Amino acid sequence: HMFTTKLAEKVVSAWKAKISQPALKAAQDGVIDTVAAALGGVTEHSVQVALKYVAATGGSGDSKLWGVNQRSNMFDAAFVNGMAAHAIDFDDSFPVMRGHPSSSLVPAIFAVGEHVGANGHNCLKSYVLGIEVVATLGRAVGKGHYLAGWHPTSTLGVFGATTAAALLLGADEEQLRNAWGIAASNSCGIIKNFGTMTKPMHTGSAARNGVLSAWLSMQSFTGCQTVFDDAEGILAMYGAQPGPELFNAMQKFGTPWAIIAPGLYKKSWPSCYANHKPLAGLFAIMKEHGLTGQDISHVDVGFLPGVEKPLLYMDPRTTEEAKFSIEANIGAALLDGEVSLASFEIEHLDRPAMRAAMKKVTRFDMPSETTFSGTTGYTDIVVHTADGKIERRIEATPGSLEDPMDDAHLERKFKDCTAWMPFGESGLLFDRLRSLTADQGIKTVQP
Amino acid sequence: HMFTTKLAEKVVSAWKAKISQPALKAAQDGVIDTVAAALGGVTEHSVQVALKYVAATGGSGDSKLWGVNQRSNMFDAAFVNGMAAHAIDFDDSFPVMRGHPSSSLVPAIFAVGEHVGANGHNCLKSYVLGIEVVATLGRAVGKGHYLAGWHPTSTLGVFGATTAAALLLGADEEQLRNAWGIAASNSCGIIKNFGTMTKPMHTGSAARNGVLSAWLSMQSFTGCQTVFDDAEGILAMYGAQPGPELFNAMQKFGTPWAIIAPGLYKKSWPSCYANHKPLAGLFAIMKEHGLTGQDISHVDVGFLPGVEKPLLYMDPRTTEEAKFSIEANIGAALLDGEVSLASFEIEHLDRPAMRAAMKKVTRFDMPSETTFSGTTGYTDIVVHTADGKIERRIEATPGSLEDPMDDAHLERKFKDCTAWMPFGESGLLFDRLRSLTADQGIKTVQP
């Protein structure tokens, strides 16, 4: 009769069974995208401070810190790597959760999987199942949680990381239920911290707390075993309707896997998803009409209810703030004809030409009776030119199943994020990442 | 003109100024009570697992782990000692926050204080200010936050620990504001985990997260500097009213210090405060009427609205559950004539005569138009004897200013919690703890 008990049963049963090759491919791709995003951000101050924290702990272990020749214990590796995976806002999104599940899950899987000597098939399976848990919780809580000011990336993401870690550590149903209980008291993170270094800490903390919750569970450390149930349970606290309605969230568990439908949404640009339909539209108009930024006097960008929320900065002053500014995103597109890893570097952001481009951009509300997100809905833009206004509606979100990132584009993203690596090492890492599908030991990958 | 900005100003100004001797005395007493509670709980499985975690991290440093001959880094020392401080539910409460602030604050102060080589006066002052901050936030949030299912001990206690650690680390106003922003994304903990080992983890995590948030802030790691303000801020999210009204919560900052009025409520028994007016009344009836447990056939215990919430277990099966059971508390009182450290040990809980005593206890609802807490309001009990029923209303909460714990009793509590220590070492430690008032180095105390 308990939602928590039923979910743990479904998860552990699926763990013991074979899982579809399409699910494992989707997981493989998620790993590559998440490691790419991390390696594109390891120079950020946030990550550099995370490394200082590791020095300050005196900790040691066998779990690799990505992008540096250092290892630490599984908890602190998950912290550092989860920070890194979110540091430049280039990791995936997941509309069912309204957040970024992979930037906690993948770090947790590498940290624990390296510690226990797991092989690729099981690592990838644990990712599929962690995503399935996050999708279930996301469906249960619905739209209000994010709108209330919580960052579901961490508030719900911690349970994904917990699930995968617990499975890899050998949890049974009881240990998994206990782990989720522990994790529920470590579910945190708020949207008001967007545009600061605390945002990537959400995923570092969620990864670390997921690993810790699972590890504690294996030591007979107790937490509530029905933590998703009842008004007192964390899902109700976050706005779910407790009781029989909850079970609707898991009615199609694994049929299909949420990692395949709607799937992980892979970012084409390192910034908030609310920028992305606008950018796709703008680049399309520029390409189709043969316009550069010099031919465009203004761009109006529309937002459905609930979509503009994270775009907190109209005049961003730091690299982190710029990722949450449509003005900076569209301004860079107009000035440079592209948005890249370098676009939000403080040196580029502070260019006088960039500040002028940003002034060409205005926001407007699009009417609706319901609310949407950066990864859903549709966008209206208006591009002003010498010969009049060009209006466009963008229906497909870049990275969704309606505008998916294919293998060639994912490889190019990986290449771009790892351009700093020394001769040949990016290619070799890419091949090793892909070997998880061949059941290679995850410890051999060493990102 | 922001609440957050004003609060940081008040705190930092007070830090630079001298503070009254009564406030320092109240801080000294809180340190002693907190260390006592911790040392009474260091053999609990929760703490033993915390020490296993420290072993797993490979961490090292100069911050002493209480009750063992081991040291680690400041983050992990705060975690272990915060766990210990709350492990047997004997640490203080604070009605303005409806939680236990000292069990995160005092571990944070020892961890950071030992690291930086602080002296007693500054350590005690940081405690006073930490408490002032959590009192301000508690007043802002009001009654609804606990009733909604969050554990204010950790959701708000993290800010206490952050404040004291930041001050000890040398924070200015900007750094303090940033540290609070970082902490607000690490504010967590739910009441559904009461009666499990996750409850003391609330305080370990809050202590560690407070130390970490303060430390991060000193590395120019950013968080929101207005995190207590607006609908988007953590206080509003927890049910405070944003806007000018927020300032009402800090209007008499330090006049008087909240650590003096209403002060820290020191527990006479190692269990949930909702058991304590009932216990006081029962022991008073037994004393006044010359009754033992065998003379008493039944005890009815009343609860005002909002007070019974944490007493989740009517048939507790573990040591942790028994602390949240009026049946176990009154049962032990009837059977043994006292409630002690040993009452909730599993061997004692499992005594047939103890289970028999527990069956003598029933709960009832007391009517009111408002809600109360274990540390406020009043309690009706009815004690059934051969020659009739004895009714009593208990108005004063044990440990409040209306029924305060004096020096002799606090000293007895310390003695009882440390009786396991090698000959004479408890008294030596008691004297070293009192040396903080003499501005001795905190590094010298070594609980």
CB B129 within 8 A of CB B164: yes
Cα of B60 to nearest chain A Cα, Å? 5
* Whether A37 contacts A90, CB under 8 Å: yes
Neighbouring CB atoms inside 10 A of B146's CB total: 26
Would you call A272 an interface residue with chain B, using a CB distance cutoff of 8 Å?
no
| Residue B206 token pair | 């809050």
d(CA B418, CA B42): 10
Does A187 sit within 8 Å of B219, measured CB to CB?
no
Return d(Cα A295, Cα A286) in angstroms, integer.
9
Q: Are B96 and B273 in contact (CB under 8 A)?
A: no
d(C-alpha A441, C-alpha B271), whole Å: 49
Task: Quote the crossing angle between the two packed helices A120-141 and A3-16, to the nearest 10°.
Answer: 160
B88 and B270 Cβ atoms separated by less than 8 Å? yes
Q: Do A165 and A211 form a contact (C-beta atoms < 8 A)?
A: yes
For residue A437, what are the CA distances in angstroms to A35, A425, A430, A442, B8?
A: 16, 20, 12, 10, 53
Residue B270, preceding peptide bond in cis (omega within 30° of 0): no
A151 touches chain B (CB under 8 A): yes
DSSP secondary-structure letter at B84? H
Distances B107 to B40, B98, B165, B180 between C-alpha atoms, Å: 15, 19, 10, 18
Q: How far is CA A192 from CA A364, B229, B231, in A?
A: 22, 10, 10
Number of neighbouring beta carbons within 10 Å of residue B17:
9
Nearest in space to B232 (alpha carbons), one of A309, A99, A158? A309
Mutate to test the interface with B, among A80, A146, A175, A193 (most CBs of B within 10 A): A193
A282-286 long-range contacts, CB within 8 A, separation 24+? A282/A330, A282/A333, A282/A334, A282/A381, A282/A383, A283/A333, A284/A392, A284/A394, A285/A381, A285/A383, A285/A390, A285/A392, A286/A333, A286/A337
DSSP class of B172: -
Report the distance separating Cα B309 and Cα B195, nearest Å.
Answer: 12
**Coil, strand, or helix at residue B302?**
strand
Angstrom CA distances, B207 to A144, B86, B101, B187, stand at: 30, 11, 10, 11
Q: Return the amino acid letter for B256.
A: P
Q: Which of B76, B219, B224 is opposite residue A193, by nearest beta carbon? A: B224
Resolution (A): 1.5
* Angle subtended at Cα A407 by Cα A405 and Cα A413, rounded to the nearest 5 degrees: 70
Are A88 and A341 in contact, with CB atoms under 8 Å apart?
yes
Task: Write down how long chain A is.
Answer: 447
Q: How far apart are CA A254 and CA A244, in angstroms?
A: 20
Alpha-helical segments (H) within B44-195: 45-57, 74-86, 102-116, 120-141, 144-147, 152-155, 157-169, 173-184
Q: Which residues contact B56 (CB under 8 A, 6 or more apart)?
A: A61, A73, A74, A75, A215
- Burial (CB count within 10 angstroms: exposed 0-12, middle 13-18, buried 19+), residue A6: middle
Please answer yes or no on whether A57 and B57 come within 8 Å at the CB atom: yes
Closest by CA to B66, choosing from B3, B128, B4, B109, is B109
Residue B73 and residue A61: Cβ atoms within 8 Å? Answer: no
Strand ranges, E, within B12-70 = 63-64
Q: Which residue in B56, B197, B233 is closest to A221 by CB distance?
A: B197
> Which residue in chain A has the smallest CA separation from B186?
A188
The three-point CA angle A426-A431-A435 to 5° equals: 145
CATH 3.40.109.10 fits B269-399, yes or no: no
CA distance B350 to B332: 11
Which of B156, B158, B131 has the alpha carbon at shortest distance from B11?
B131
Q: How far is CA B319 from the centre of its chain?
A: 18
Rg (CA), chain A: 21
CA distance A21 to B304: 58
Most A CBs within 10 Å: which of B196, B209, B313, as the mutation test of the A interface? B196
Q: Which residues contact A312 (CB under 8 A, 6 or more apart)?
A: A194, A195, A321, A324
SS3 B58: coil
Q: Over B116-146, what HEC string results?
A: HCCEHHHHHHHHHHHHHHHHHHHHHHCCHHH
Alpha carbons A355 and B407: distance in angstroms, whole number? 66
Residue with tokens 């924290």: A53
Of A59, A149, A219, the CB nearest to B52: A219
Distance CA A161, CA A105 (A): 4
Distance CA B376, CA A116 (A): 50
Which residue type does B434 have? R
Is A320 in the B-facing interface, judged by CB distances under 8 Å? yes
Report the gap between the CA of A61 and the closest CA in chain B (Å).
7
Phi/psi at A75 (5° precision): -70, -50
b/e for A424-444, b at 16 or more Cβ within 10 A?
eebeebbeebbbbbeebebbe
Put simply, whether B144 touches A (Cβ < 8 Å) is no
Interstrand relation of B71-72 and B296-303 (parallel, antiparallel or unpaired) = unpaired
Angstrom CA distances, A111 to A28, A64, A77, B364, B428, stand at 16, 7, 6, 51, 44
Reading the block at residue B411, the tokens are: 């000293």
Please report where in the chains the tokens 């070799």 appear, as a residue: A428
A367 vs A361: CA distance, rounded Å: 20
- Measured CA to CA, the distance from residue B161 to residue A263 in angstroms comes to 40
Inter-chain Cβ pairs, chain A and chain B, closer than 8 A: 172
CB-CB contact of A3 with A229 (8 Å): yes
Q: Where in chain A is the domain with CATH 3.30.1330.120?
A: 269-399
Task: Indicate the helix (H) or strand (E) that contains B301.
Answer: strand B296-303
CA distance B225 to B171: 14
User: Which token pair is A278?
Assistant: 């606008």
Kindly state whether B198 is in contact with chain A, defined as any CB-CB distance less than 8 angstroms: yes
Cβ contact A360:A300 at 8 Å: no
SS3 B90: coil
Distance CA B305, CA B442 (A): 43
Phi and psi at B369, nearest 5°, equal -85, -5
DSSP tag of B42: T
Number of other residues whose CB lies within 10 A of the CB of residue A247: 14
The full 3-state SS of chain A, as one line of letters, equals CCHHHHHHHHHHHHHHCCCCHHHHHHHHHHHHHHHHHHHCCCCCHHHHHHHHHHHHHCCCCCEEECCCCEEECHHHHHHHHHHHHHCCCCCCEECCCCECCHHHHHHHHHHHHHHHCCEHHHHHHHHHHHHHHHHHHHHHHCCHHHHCCECHHHHCHHHHHHHHHHHHHCCCHHHHHHHHHHHHCCCCCEHHHCCCCHHHHHHHHHHHHHHHHHHHHHCCCCCCCCCCCCCCCHHHHCCCCCCHHHHHHHCCCCCCCCHHHHHCECCCCCCCHHHHHHHHHHHHHHHHHCCCHHHEEEEEEEECCCCCCCCCCCCCCCHHHHCCCHHHHHHHHHHHCCCCHHHHCHHHHCCHHHHHHHCCEEEEECCCCCCCCCCCCCEEEEEEECCEEEEEEECCCCCCCCCCCCHHHHHHHHHHHCCCCCCCHHHHHHHHHHHHHHCCEHHHCCC
Contact B364/B285 with Cβ under 8 angstroms?
Answer: no
Q: Indicate the pairing of strand A388-394 with strand A379-385.
A: antiparallel
Q: Nearest-5° angle of CA B393, CA B396, CA B397?
A: 110
B196 in contact with chain A, both atoms CB, cutoff 8 A:
yes
How is residue B164 annotated by DSSP? H
Spatial CB neighbours of A187, under 8 Å, sequence gap ≥ 6: A154, A155, A156, A158, A159, A234, B188
| Contact by Cβ (8 Å): B97, B269 | no
Chain mean position to CA A196? 17
Residue position matching structure tokens 């708020």? A190
Q: DSSP labels for B274-289?
A: GGHHHHHHHHHHHHHH
Helix, strand and coil in chain B, % to nearest 5? 55, 10, 35
Q: Cβ contacts of residue B54 below 8 Å, gap of 6+?
A: B65, B70, B72, B76, B80
Q: What span, in angstroms and rounded, lies between the C-alpha atoms of B6 and B394? A: 40
Are the beta carbons of A198 and B53 separated by less than 8 Å? Answer: no
Output the CA–CA distances (angstroms, integers) from residue A87 to A74, A197, B53, B187, B268, in the order listed.
20, 8, 27, 21, 48
Q: CA A209, A211, A213, A218: dihedral to nearest 10 degrees? A: -160
What SS3 state is found at B222?
A: coil
Class of domain A1-268+400-447 (CATH, top level): mainly alpha
C-beta of residue A230 within 8 angstroms of C-beta of residue B312: no
Answer yes or no: are the C-beta atoms of A272 and A310 closer than 8 Å: yes
Distance CA(A333)–CA(A336), nearest Å, equals 6
H-run or E-run covering B300: strand B296-303
Radius of gyration of chain B (CA): 21
For tokens 């006049």, the residue is: B255
Q: What is the DSSP string of B337-401?
A: SS--GGGGSHHHHT-HHHHHHHTTEEEEEPP-SS---TTSS-EEEEEEETTEEEEEEE-SPTTST
Contact A223 B196 (CB under 8 A): yes
**Which residue bears the tokens 């106003």?**
B173
B48: CB partners within 8 A, 6+ apart = none
Residue with tokens 């924070």: B171
Cβ A7 vs Cβ A136: under 8 Å: yes
Q: What is the CA A423 to chain-centroid distance, rounded?
A: 29
List beta partners, residue A334.
Answer: none
- In angstroms, the separation between the Cα of residue A226 and the nearest Cα of chain B is 9
B55 touches chain A (CB under 8 A): no
**Bridge partners for B303 per DSSP:** B365
Contact yes or no for A187/B187 (Cβ under 8 A) = no
Q: Is the CB of residue B177 less than 8 Å away from at least one CB of chain A?
A: no
Query: Are the C-beta atoms of A184 and B193 separated by less than 8 Å?
Result: yes
Cβ contacts of B422 within 8 Å, gap of 6 or more: none
Contacts B228 to A, Cβ<8 Å: none
Geometric angle at alpha carbon B404, from B402 and B406, rounded to 5°: 150
Experimental technique, in short, is: X-ray
**Secondary element (H or E) of residue B298:** strand B296-303
Long-range contacts of B307-311 (CB under 8 A, 24+ apart): B307/B274, B307/B371, B307/B372, B307/B373, B307/B374, B307/B377, B308/B274, B308/B363, B308/B365, B309/B146, B309/B147, B309/B191, B310/B191, B310/B194, B310/B272, B310/B274, B310/B374, B311/B272, B311/B274, B311/B275, B311/B363
B182 vs A: CB within 8 A: yes
C-alpha to C-alpha distance for B82 and B230, rounded to whole angstroms: 31
User: Which of B218, B148, B235 lies closest to B178, judged by CA?
Assistant: B218
Q: With contact defined as beta carbons under 8 Å apart, do B371 and B143 qualify?
A: yes
Torsion from C-alpha of A379, A380, A384, A388, nearest 10 degrees: 140
Please tell me the distance from the alpha carbon of residue A61 to that of residue A159, in angstroms, as a whole number. 24
